[PDB]
């Protein structure tokens, strides 16, 4: 399945680049395809949480 990676993270808006490379920006209360709904955004430490329980981080190598 397509996996999104955190590209730019600031309070409020978070930038995610998918596995295919599509880049978008999201808010706290929003729906994320393939994952569900963003139930929490942590601008500090760069962790994103989904209502389905998935954890979204940066690219481990590209970091």
């Amino acid at each position: 399945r397509i996996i999104y990676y955190i590209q730019a993270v600031i309070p409020g808006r978070a930038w995610l680049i998918g596995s295919n490379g599509s880049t978008l920006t999201v808010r706290e209360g929003s729906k994320i395809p393939g994952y569900g709904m963003v139930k929490l955004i942590d601008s500090l430490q760069g962790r994103i949480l989904t209502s389905s329980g998935q954890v979204i981080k940066f690219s481990q190598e590209d970091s």
């Binding site: 600031i10 309070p11 409020g12 920006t25």
Partner: peptide, 10 residues
């Protein structure tokens, strides 16, 4: 530098 609310979508 922190901005209240949420930044508008470009």
């Amino acid at each position: 530098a922190a901005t209240p609310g949420t930044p508008p979508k470009p």
